[PDB]
Design a binder for these strands. Structure first.
Lengths: 64, 46, 141, 59, 145, 68, 70, 75, 191
RNA sequence: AACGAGACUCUGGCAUGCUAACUAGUUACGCGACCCCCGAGCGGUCGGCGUCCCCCAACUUCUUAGAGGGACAAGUGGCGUUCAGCCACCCGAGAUUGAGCAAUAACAGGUCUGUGAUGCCCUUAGAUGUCGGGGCUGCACGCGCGCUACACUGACUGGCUCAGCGUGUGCCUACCCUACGCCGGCAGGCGCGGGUAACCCGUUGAACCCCAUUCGUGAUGGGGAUCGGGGAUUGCAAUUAUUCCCCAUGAACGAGGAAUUCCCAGUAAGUGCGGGUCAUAAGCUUGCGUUGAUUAAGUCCCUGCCCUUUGUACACACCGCCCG
């Protein structure tokens, strides 16, 4: 939306979800706040410690 | 042919050719009316 | 220099020109009606293809132990597109190569030596390495 | 020696084959000595079914 | 440069000055690309320029070198026709005469009424080919009630 | 991966440690050559396995008592 | 044409090394070893990869002919 | 398919523009001459060979299947 | 230069990655600069192993596609040497910085996927890996030059260098920056 | 306790260790011969290029094939009951290179046209047992496996330069693989010679690829279907064209609906070759090299399979059973 482009980085990978394992739950640290953390769904193959490019942190994951 | 002796007169215009080109050995063909299984539809009865 | 040192694309294009100056090579009449191999679909664009191919003939004899009319054709043969059928390899013409090698032998740049094949005369081997340095003189190797 | 042929007589069912192979072996020992004592000692003292071929000369 | 002329008419087919000389000539029937790269070289002219750059003097020679090929020493095997059959000579056939010649040989093979003319008249393949799965024009077939 | 040891290894590994406890080291290569002499293992690949498990057991036997 | 290029590179790299290994001391060639193996690209090592053997029911070793149910 | 117009030899405006398009364009390939003018493309191949003998263009790379030419190599 | 290869003429120094997000999956100059893009044929037997190999090589790999061009990697390298050459004459830069912008500008920020509910199509918006962005961006722009030269008088080299310009400076005349924005326009809707 | 799994056999990957080689090489000279000064020098010599010469030379790295060794979750760090194991890393060839072999029980699966394997029935002199001719190729149509294409990442014409698994007359009853010389545009013909084969063909001088011309976005020179005439080879015989070659003719086709197949590393795809059938002839099948990607490191959504629990009017087993 009218939020500027955010950047947030992985702290840990949780497990794979979706109905073919195509989605991946992941925990991410906000990269400006070190006590803030949100759970996300990320499509691509990820390792740990890599940075994403979030368009919002209003969105939050809860299920497949 | 297979049973039949088809008679022919020899012309001077036939020279070089064989005898067997001037007598056929099959019926040219007619049809037809496609039959039953003649496609992916024929089936069932009981 | 030895002919090994230089580029070979350059080698032929000066060797072909060399021969045609000196009145060398008595050519066959058929040279403007000749497909040139069984696997071609056309005549060459070139109008001096005979001069070009005699260059490539004499070069290979310098390297390898020398071989007859059969082997020269096998070196030149390529792929044959049979249309709807899959492509296959085949050999080209023979009677052209049989005129090439006999035309060279008239100049005594080759000669029928022992062990089943023509081999290149010392006079021939002199003339190759003579123009081999002319290549390096020209551009700059 | 390779033989690559059908595993099924009267072909039916999934298409299968069978590789058979035979491996021959050759090796030769060259001697130079009188032909008598060679042809004497050679033909004896052989237990298995293994062939031997003596040659007069080759070199 | 060279604005002089373009598309022209020659015997029985209109030939453009747009295309290269050899390839331009091929449009005339009885002349393939292979037949033209010979005839141009017997005429001793360039094939490295367009057909619209030829002069009238030049093209007048072309048709003569074409239509008397034996007399300009193009071999007999390199012709369309060797001993036509019942005409007694080597021949080279060009555009509108080709069709006339062709229609004769069809007529001849129904005159004698060989296997050939029958297959021609029935509209079926002359040469050894299966017609079971080859053709179609036709395919609408039904059988139900 | 995989390669979980079978019972044929674990049966003889225990036996070989009980009756030749003294001969054992804790190196792979030494424990191999001992198994080669105190017994015959009819394969080569099998020998390389039984040694490695004999080694892996001998690590734990130098701690508290094994129950096998 | 291709695989020959990698072969001649792999040999000349090792050739140079062997000359130092035999007639010169350790610390000369140890240095040279660190440089080459940095951008290793099979200069001092060799691929174990060669072609696998075809089995029936395919034109390739893995690829299979088409299967029809009707 | 489509119909695109082409010319196998030059006329006035093409030829005159051809001499003055050179300093205005940094990249020069036969393909670019196909679009900016209505030119066959094989015409543009030999047209550039002519210009290089005058030194109005400069070669920068050459190959069998593609060739590049530049303005004058100035800056 | 004497201790680090160029490209045969093109510096890999004065080349930056201008994101902090997409570096460590874009690299070209740490020591990974080489005279040519080629490998011995190790590129993948682990998931992490893909990343390491150069960006310039990855570009050459994804350029040869669609049947007739497979297994012709040497022909492919001809197109790339002309590409950088054309890019340098045409605009005048270190022509790798062009490519790095072209990759970074073409990678999506958000993406959609499928989710099964009620036997009917519903879609869900999700994020994307940096490794995904690079893989996608290399795919997209290579499709452009392949598409354009399928009936054009222009060669693929010319087409490809044009496609990296319009990607490196967004202008929506490329096949990439169009198709990027299509995905994100969907991802806004169903979210 | 037993069978299957594994173990096993074959194959690939690691040896400057071992064993030994004119039917395998290398190196070294001895060399003398050819070649060009091409570089120092002069041409010699020194250096460079291959071939002949090579030995009573030296050696076995390369090639060949035998005996052996090497890899075990071995070592380290995490994790696990600290058990069985799992993950990362060092060394390095990482614990999966690919095949062969494979249980219990079953199917009214295929095969009486492989069988001098076989029951019963039939037929057996006007024979279902021999010669001649025709057919299995006949087309308004429906479907499957494939091959070749729709071009410029191309075609065309020249030039350069690399490989492997094999096979071959002396066999079946008449037959092989071919070098070299000569004649022909080509198919081909003709004269001589070798090969029982790491010995002769064949240092298999293959294609894609590579380098330089020509064509120009045009159903075009892309595509090569259809079709006319002519020339060769096999055979006792070539017509409904056996096969091969030359000239001419120049179609559909300009990226493909509903659907659907196959594939994870020297793998897919592109590209050629050998073997099989063979008197003549692969668009097939079986193996082999060469060039060599993108994408994944997952899941039970679809399709299907293994184990437990549960329900059943089913057991010819849901392709079941059963109501008006």
């Amino acid at each position: 939306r009218v939020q500027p482009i955010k950047l947030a980085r992985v702290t840990k990978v949780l497990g794979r979800t979706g109905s073919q394992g195509q989605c991946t739950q992941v925990r991410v640290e906000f990269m400006d706040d070190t006590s803030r953390s949100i759970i996300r769904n990320v499509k691509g193959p990820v390792r740990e410690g890599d940075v994403l490019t979030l368009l919002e942190s209003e969105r939050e994951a809860r299920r497949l | 042919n297979g049973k039949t002796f088809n008679q022919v007169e020899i012309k001077p215009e036939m020279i070089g050719h064989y005898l067997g080109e001037f007598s056929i050995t099959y019926k040219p063909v007619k049809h037809g009316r496609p039959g039953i299984g003649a496609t992916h539809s024929s089936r069932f009865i009981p | 220099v030895t002919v090994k040192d230089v580029n070979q694309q350059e080698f032929v294009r000066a060797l072909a020109a060399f021969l045609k100056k000196s009145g060398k090579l008595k050519v066959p009449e058929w040279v403007d009606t000749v497909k040139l191999a069984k696997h071609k679909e056309l005549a060459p664009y070139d109008e001096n293809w005979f001069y070009t191919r005699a260059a490539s003939t004499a070069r290979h004899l310098y390297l390898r132990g020398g071989a007859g009319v059969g082997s020269m054709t096998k070196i030149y043969g390529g792929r044959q597109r049979n249309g709807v059928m899959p492509s296959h390899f085949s050999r080209g013409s023979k009677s052209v190569a049989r005129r090439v090698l006999q035309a060279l032998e008239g100049l005594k740049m080759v000669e029928k030596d022992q062990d089943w094949g023509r081999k290149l005369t010392p006079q021939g081997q002199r003339d190759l390495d003579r123009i081999a340095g002319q290549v390096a003189a020209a551009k700059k190797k | 020696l390779r033989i690559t042929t059908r595993k099924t007589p009267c072909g039916e069912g999934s298409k299968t084959w069978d590789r058979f192979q035979m491996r021959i072996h050759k090796r030769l020992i060259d001697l130079h000595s009188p032909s008598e004592i060679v042809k004497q000692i050679t033909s004896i003292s052989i237990e298995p079914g293994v062939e031997v071929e003596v040659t007069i000369a080759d070199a | 440069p060279e604005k002089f002329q373009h598309i022209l008419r020659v015997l029985n087919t209109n030939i453009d000055g747009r295309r290269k000389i050899a390839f331009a000539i091929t449009a005339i029937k009885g002349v393939g690309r292979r037949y033209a790269h010979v005839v141009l070289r017997k005429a001793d002219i360039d094939l490295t320029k367009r057909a619209g750059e030829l002069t009238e003097d030049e093209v007048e020679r072309v048709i003569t070198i074409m239509q008397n090929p034996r007399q300009y020493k193009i071999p007999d095997w390199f012709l369309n026709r060797q001993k036509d059959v019942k005409d007694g000579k080597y021949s080279q056939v060009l555009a509108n005469g080709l069709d006339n010649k062709l229609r004769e040989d069809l007529e001849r093979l129904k005159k004698i009424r060989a296997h050939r003319g029958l297959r021609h008249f029935w509209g079926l393949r002359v040469r050894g080919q299966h017609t079971k799965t080859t053709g179609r024009r036709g395919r609408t077939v039904g059988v139900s009630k | 991966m995989g390669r979980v040891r079978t019972k044929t290894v674990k049966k003889a590994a225990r036996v070989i440690i009980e009756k030749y406890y003294t001969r054992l080291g804790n190196d792979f290569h030494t424990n191999k050559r001992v198994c080669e002499e105190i017994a015959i293992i009819p394969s080569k690949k099998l020998r390389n396995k039984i040694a490695g498990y004999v080694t892996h057991l001998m690590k734990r036997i130098q701690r508290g008592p094994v129950r096998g | 044409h291709v695989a020959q290029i990698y072969a001649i590179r792999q040999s000349i790299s090792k050739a140079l090394v062997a000359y130092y290994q035999k007639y010169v001391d350790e610390a000369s060639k140890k240095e040279i070893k660190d440089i080459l193996i940095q951008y290793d690209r099979t200069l001092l090592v060799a691929d174990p990869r060669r072609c696998e053997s075809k089995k029936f029911g395919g034109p390739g070793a893995r690829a299979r002919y088409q299967k029809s149910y009707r | 398919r489509d119909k695109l117009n082409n010319l196998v030899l030059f006329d006035k405006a093409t030829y005159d523009k051809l001499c003055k398009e050179v300093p205005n364009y940094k990249l020069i390939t036969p393909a670019v001459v196909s679009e900016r003018l209505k030119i066959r493309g094989s015409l543009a191949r030999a047209a550039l060979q002519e210009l290089l003998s005058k030194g109005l263009i400069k070669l920068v790379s050459k190959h069998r299947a593609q060739v590049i030419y530049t303005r004058n190599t100035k800056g | 230069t004497p201790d680090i290869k160029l490209f045969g003429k093109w510096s890999t120094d004065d080349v930056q990655i201008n994101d902090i997000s997409l570096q460590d999956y874009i690299a070209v100059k740490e020591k990974y600069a080489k005279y040519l893009p080629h490998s011995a044929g190790r590129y993948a037997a682990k998931r992490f192993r893909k990343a390491q190999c150069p960006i310039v090589e990855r570009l050459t790999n994804s350029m040869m596609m669609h049947g007739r061009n497979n297994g012709k990697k040497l022909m492919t390298v001809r197109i790339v040497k002309h590409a950088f050459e054309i890019i340098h004459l045409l605009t005048g830069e270190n022509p790798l910085q062009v490519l790095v912008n072209a990759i970074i500008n073409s990678g999506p920020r958000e993406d959609s996927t499928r989710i099964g509910r009620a036997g009917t199509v519903r879609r869900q918006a999700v994020d994307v890996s940096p490794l995904r962005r690079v893989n996608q961006a290399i795919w997209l722009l290579c499709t452009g030059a392949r598409e354009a030269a399928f009936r054009n008088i222009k060669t693929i080299a010319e087409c490809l260098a044009d496609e990296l310009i319009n990607a490196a400076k967004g202008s929506s005349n490329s096949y990439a920056i169009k198709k990027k924005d299509e995905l994100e326009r969907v991802a806004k809707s169903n979210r």
